From a paper:
Among diverse BMCs, carboxysomes are specific CO2-fixing BMCs found in all cyanobacteria and many proteobacteria. The carboxysome uses a polyhedral protein shell to encapsulate the key CO2 fixation enzymes, ribulose-1,5-bisphosphate carboxylase/oxygenase (Rubisco) and carbonic anhydrase (CA). Carboxysome shells are typically composed of three groups of structural components that form hexamers, pentamers, and trimers. Here, we generated recombinant α-carboxysome shells of Halothiobacillus neapolitanus by expressing all the shell proteins (involving three CsoS1 hexameric proteins and two CsoS4 pentameric proteins), together with the C-terminal domain of CsoS2 (CsoS2-C) that mediates shell assembly.
CsoS1A and CsoS1C differ by only two amino acids (3rd and 97th amino acids). The cryo-EM structure at 1.8-Å resolution showed that the resulting T = 9 shell resembles the T = 9 mini-shell formed by CsoS1A. Therefore, we speculate that CsoS1A and CsoS1C share similar features and can be naturally interchangeable during shell assembly. We confirmed that, similar to CsoS1A, CsoS1C can form a hexamer alone, while when coexpressed with CsoS1B, CsoS1C can form CsoS1C/B heterohexamers. Mini-shells (~25 nm, T = 3) can be formed in the presence of a single type of hexamer (CsoS1A or CsoS1C) and pentamer (CsoS4A).
Numbering used by the authors:
A (entry chain X): 706 to 725
B (entry chain 4): 1 to 81
C (entry chain A), I (entry chain D): 4 to 96
D (entry chain B), K (entry chain J): 4 to 97
E (entry chain C), G (entry chain F): 6 to 96
F (entry chain Z): 773 to 824, 829 to 869
H (entry chain E): 6 to 97
J (entry chain H): 6 to 95
Write the structure that this text describes.
């Protein structure tokens, strides 16, 4: 629904609060 | 077999393809003697005293029975003057 | 540019690392603080900034360098590194 | 504050090494004394501290970096190194 | 020009061949050769966008059959000012 | 034979620590009855956890494009049997 | 004692564990740690021949399951004087 | 001369054999031995084009069966002036 | 020790290289002139001497180091070294 | 460092192995060896709590397969002053 | 006889211990530094010497005493004891 840089690289980033 | 001294390298860009990639050296029995050219099967520097084989043995010494050589260096003499 | 969040991207080869650095610094307000040759082909580029900026930057960088050369190894964020870790972090490229 | 025990984490690449070092120094009272580029992609981070602190730190660091990049190679604790081994151990990171 | 062309190779000989082909094919400046580690070598050129397109294509075509070959061929048309700090200026 | 065959046996410690040759008498080996100084008395002291290649040798079989041919005529030392030599642009030399 | 014992490992952590086990197991002196390249690390000890034998066996046992493990374990009882020029003297 | 010949090998022993064969084959100057990283070694020679051609052919033949072998044998007869900035002038 | 012949042994890892150097210098009258860390794990040891001495030394070293560690890569003899190559050969370890 | 670690064995040889392993494994001080009677032997170490934990674990691992083996491996993190009268020193 | 290694043999009863000590001292150049009556019938014999000598000696003693009397309990070698363990080791037999 909300577009921008936050929609990129899903499943590739590992420092995020969701990952932790 | 003859004993010859390596004088320098010999380069022939347009030589026949059957010579392969082998290097060639200018050799003579002594400084001032007639120059000859040998296939260097060993890897020799100028001033080395080497052992050269001719005739049909030079062909196999240079890599194959059909190699186009009649003079091949087959060894460096350990101590000579 | 202020903020102490750290963003890191590790690639195989230098070309994906440079592409990642370009994309990161274009995407958000982050500072490129270092490029490190790890050895064995690994290259790591590091950015600092605010937490949201670093999140956006690392996402853009990982997206950009994924299919470049031998590709991406890691894309990681640390919102606040311990003061001890600062000693092993470069300050300028 | 440093100590007698030694904690070591080896990773493939630098990003898991930095994550491990951050987790280690946050988890317990340990001092980061070295980040070594071993060669071939191996990176090792070394910490010193009291024995329980080093134990906790190494466990946290091993958990933190295992899914980061190319991951963890080894997590190791030596409660008291022989005095000769001290000569091949860094005192401060470079 | 400010466009950037990059070629990554396995080994140094294909990198030198790529640099030679790149600089012969178009009006680009060779700004660096980097030993990455693990055998990777990267050569970087700068120039106009069209020149860099031509140069990178020629370098990739020339170096792919040399040695262990070609890893990447990449163009950054507009380089951010931050990235200039990690790019070499002269070889 | 006094010494175990070289192919079959691999020594735990090479050099002067080899055990492939059967030495009788009062040598420095230790049998099953003896304990200490090795085995679990060396590997069981320090806790350890186990986690889960780019080189010239590893690249020796990397996929390559088709080898260039040579179509030139005239005597030019145009050998095709030896090592692959390349000229500018990847042309066959 | 002037015998020489060597252990080679993949990575530094098994090398450090091997050095610790070697110096604890027998009467030897740690004389060097060398980064060979490509991940190889070598640790070297000196001492009496039997002591070096015991130390190297203990070190190989200790570092075997640590990290990427053990590569080599070797003893030279009488080092030629030429070889001393490539051996480190202090760690 | 201004031609350039390079030979890349896996390991240093084939590189030294290649350099020796190259310099024994023709009048070329050894200008560099580069440890590329990861085990690659490159040796570079300069000279007249025919000399460099002969040297590189001989060197590639010599080092093919030595050690872990040959990676590349390349000749550049006319070197662009830009490339000279990344080429060593004397061995280190 | 005189003579300009050159013997080289390349190994995977340093331990077989040191064993090879020891065997070479014990077997014949040769001078150990260098130990080079090539990169990627390759190690090369170089000796100088007379052709017969270097021949014997390289044979002994190749025999000795083949079962040590990750083993032997190359064992090579050059009877006469071109003066150009002397610039890339170490003179002392 | 006033924690106390104790290892009790059947026979002297596992006791000496345990003492060696304990002192090598962590920063502890060996304070005594006691012949209890009937074959029991006890070795005692002092130090910081975490160091004592490491040392006692290592000693128990080392001595359990030596001779007639291991009887007890115990840690007292803080020793009452009364008990110090029955503990050996140095 | 100078030596840092320690060799120990524990037996049930005194006769196997004496046989072990005799075999050990005949086999290699080791010093007999202790014969300890442990209690409950255990007897321990301790030797010191160079590492290879102690290995040979302890092997010989363990072979010799295993079928004598009530037999052998333990045969153990420590190539170098910690400096603190030296305080609980006898220096000469009593
Ligand atoms: Mg982009």
């Amino acid at each position: 629904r909300i577009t921008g840089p936050g929609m990129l690289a899903t499943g590739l980033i590992t420092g995020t609060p969701e990952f932790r | 077999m003859k004993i010859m001294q390596v004088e320098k390298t010999l380069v022939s860009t347009n030589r026949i393809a059957d010579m392969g990639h082998k290097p060639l050296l200018v050799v003579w029995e002594k400084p001032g003697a007639p120059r000859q050219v040998a296939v260097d099967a060993i890897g020799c520097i100028p001033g080395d005293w080497v052992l050269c084989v001719g005739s049909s043995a030079a062909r196999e010494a240079a890599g194959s029975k059909s190699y186009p050589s009649d003079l091949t260096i087959i060894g460096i003499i350990d101590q000579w003057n | 540019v202020t903020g102490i969040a750290l963003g890191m991207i590790e690639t195989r080869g230098l070309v994906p690392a440079i592409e990642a650095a370009d994309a990161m610094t274009k995407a958000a307000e982050v500072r490129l603080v270092g490029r490190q040759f790890v050895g064995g082909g690994y290259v790591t580029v590091l950015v600092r900034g605010e937490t949201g900026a670093v999140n956006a930057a690392v996402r853009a960088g990982a997206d950009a360098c994924e299919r470049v050369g031998d590709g991406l190894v890691a894309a990681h964020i640390i919102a606040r590194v311990h003061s001890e870790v600062e000693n092993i972090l470069p300050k300028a490229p």
